[PDB]
């Protein structure tokens, strides 16, 4: 990592990030099996089989009920029917609105008749088979058959004539083992009305994630990247519920597609910088902070940091929440004297004190003379800085103090550079096009 301080505009950039961007969605359709658990009956006292058989059957009744609630909440997620504004906003529509809607529309196509018939018919002999849908889209279909393999053959024979209390206790404990995955699946869909927020170890176990990531049609680099980041692959995909068709549960999980795997990216963060006199006590501000990433010779701009993650060097952004910017916009970081690109800047007559945390360094602005001191761990107070826009590295300091509020600094080690230049002496209007 490399960070360069720009005293000309009191901003910094870190220019050593690789990146991955999500481009599309790879869908996967699962199908559990419970078998004919609804027919056999336990009717002799309380036993271990008694308390588990009733537990399993109760899950099936509940899961049929939540299907009548998903159908009601899908009308509110696809169009602003009665969303209203009011207050305490959940701020839906930021990124997910264009993602959940696409996923739901696939579910409607699947949950029709003669479609689940095809999915189930294609898996009659094997536990893995790729199949196409009505509208050309191809899906991967997986069948998991532990309970049906256990309830059918070596549970019914034990439970005869409704005599459901046997000296054999191995079966009683064993039934609890195979039942655990099913109970977790139904409970998750029940609490979220069918739309789980992220993949869990019960919708798609690890052995079923490697087989679902090495079967996609992709490059040989994308596969090797996604196998080393299972944590963030799991954390960026959601599942949907299709329904309860017979004695089985059918649901689909959306997996992300990383269309770009290696390309430089950088962060820009700015701080107010006046260096003005008491008269005309106003100055400039860079409102161009955020992320930058290259995909096809045209940078994508993310206005705020919350839209992208970080796992060391990699940056897990999304392509649906970025705005296309001409690649000449990198010139602003080089210099402001250049007039080739109209460089964004905003002014203001009320300069406030503010501190910006850099991923490697730190930025401080301190104008009204309040005690703004650098701090550390072994030494409480090191020195009192003058005015503001004094970039401080975490190698030299540990904390910064402003209005009796401390800020901690990260321990990441990397190269630091400072670029000498003349700050804006007085208020200028060569480039102040926006505001």
């Amino acid at each position, epitope marked *: 990592l490399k960070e360069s301080y720009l005293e000309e505009s009191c901003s910094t950039i870190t220019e050593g990030y*690789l990146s991955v961007l999500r*481009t*599309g969605w*790879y869908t996967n359709v699962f199908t559990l099996e419970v078998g004919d658990v609804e027919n056999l009956t336990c009717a002799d006292g309380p036993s271990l089989i008694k308390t588990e058989l009733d537990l399993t059957k109760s899950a099936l009744r509940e899961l049929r009920t939540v299907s009548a609630d998903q159908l009601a909440r899908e009308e509110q997620i696809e169009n602003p029917r009665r969303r209203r504004f009011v207050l305490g906003a959940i701020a839906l529509g930021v990124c997910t609105a264009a993602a959940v809607t696409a996923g739901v529309a696939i579910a409607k196509t699947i949950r029709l008749e003669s479609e689940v018939t095809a999915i189930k018919n294609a898996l009659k002999k094997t536990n893995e088979a*790729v199949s196409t849908l009505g509208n050309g889209v*191809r899906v991967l279909a997986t069948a998991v058959r532990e309970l049906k393999d256990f309830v059918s053959k070596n549970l019914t024979r034990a439970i005869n004539k409704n005599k459901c209390d046997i000296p054999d206790l191995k079966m009683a404990v064993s039934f609890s083992q195979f039942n655990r995955r099913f109970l977790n699946v139904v409970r998750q869909f029940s609490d979220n009305a069918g739309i789980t927020p992220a993949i869990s170890l019960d919708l798609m176990t690890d052995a079923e994630l490697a087989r679902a990531v090495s*079967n*996609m*049609p*992709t*490059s*040989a*680099g994308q596969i*090797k*990247l996604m196998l080393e980041n299972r944590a963030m692959v799991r954390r960026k995909g959601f599942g949907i519920l299709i329904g309860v068709y017979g004695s089985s549960v059918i649901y689909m999980v959306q997996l992300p*597609i990383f*269309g770009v*795997i*290696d*390309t*430089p990216c950088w962060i820009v963060k700015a701080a107010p910088s006046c260096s003005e006199k008491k008269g005309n006590y106003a100055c400039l501000l860079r409102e161009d902070q955020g992320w930058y990433c*290259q*995909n*096809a*010779g045209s940078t994508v701009y993310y206005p705020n940091e919350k839209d992208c993650e970080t796992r060391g060097d990699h940056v897990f952004c999304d392509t649906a929440c970025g705005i296309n910017v001409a*690649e000449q916009s990198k010139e602003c970081n080089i210099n402001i004297s250049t007039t080739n690109y109209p460089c964004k800047v905003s002014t203001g007559r009320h300069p406030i004190s503010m501190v910006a945390l850099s991923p490697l360094g730190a930025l401080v602005a301190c104008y009204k003379g309040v005690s703004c001191s650098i701090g550390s761990n072994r030494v409480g107070i090191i020195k009192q800085l003058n005015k503001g826009c004094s970039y401080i590295t975490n190698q030299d300091a540990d904390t910064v103090t402003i209005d009796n509020t401390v800020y901690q600094l990260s321990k990441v080690e990397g190269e630091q550079h400072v670029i000498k230049g003349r700050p804006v002496s007085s208020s200028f209007d060569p480039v102040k096009f926006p505001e």
Partner: antibody
Amino acid sequence: QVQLVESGGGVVKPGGSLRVSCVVSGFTFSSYRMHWVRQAPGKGLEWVSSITASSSYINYAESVKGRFTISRDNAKNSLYLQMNSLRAEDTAVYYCARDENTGISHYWFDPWGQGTLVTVSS
Amino acid sequence: QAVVTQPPSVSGAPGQRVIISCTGSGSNLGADYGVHWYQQLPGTAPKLLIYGDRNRPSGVPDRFSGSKSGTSASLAITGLQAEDEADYYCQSYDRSLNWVFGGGTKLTVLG
């Protein structure tokens, strides 16, 4: 306006080494994966190597694994292909081609270069 | 593991229609990959003809077309003429062999 130029071809005795080069111009070099494609004289095309845009993931053809070396330098806008233990059946014309993809299931080489020739004989 | 098979040569006459078939396998085209076509004139480097299994880049004279279905793809030329005399290749991707190229066919005009 995209333009690729190859250089470094020549004649080398078997069991030697050579460093082919390819210098690009007219597009942002540090955003595209680049390839090396060879063609024997009078034969069909064949893929040889590949490298991502930051020298992170490198793929080699099975026939030449462990003997070649692909490298990049984003500052000078060029990529190199160091060869070792050259054999008689390795003479061909070498191309450097940019990579194009739609994201999931399409991959092709749109801007093919001009080419350089390498002869291996005893 | 897998390889793409292409006929050695196909001969035709001016004014007719020519079909070139690119036969894949279970791991090349069966896994939903692409087929792309390159034309190599006898003296220069190849150029892109068909990408995305049906599309046409700018400069293609609106008479070349192709399609993919199952594990086989074909290339169609309507209104054959004299200067369409070159070698044609079909490309794809493979699970274990990475990028793969077809055998390469030579088109002959009988005029």
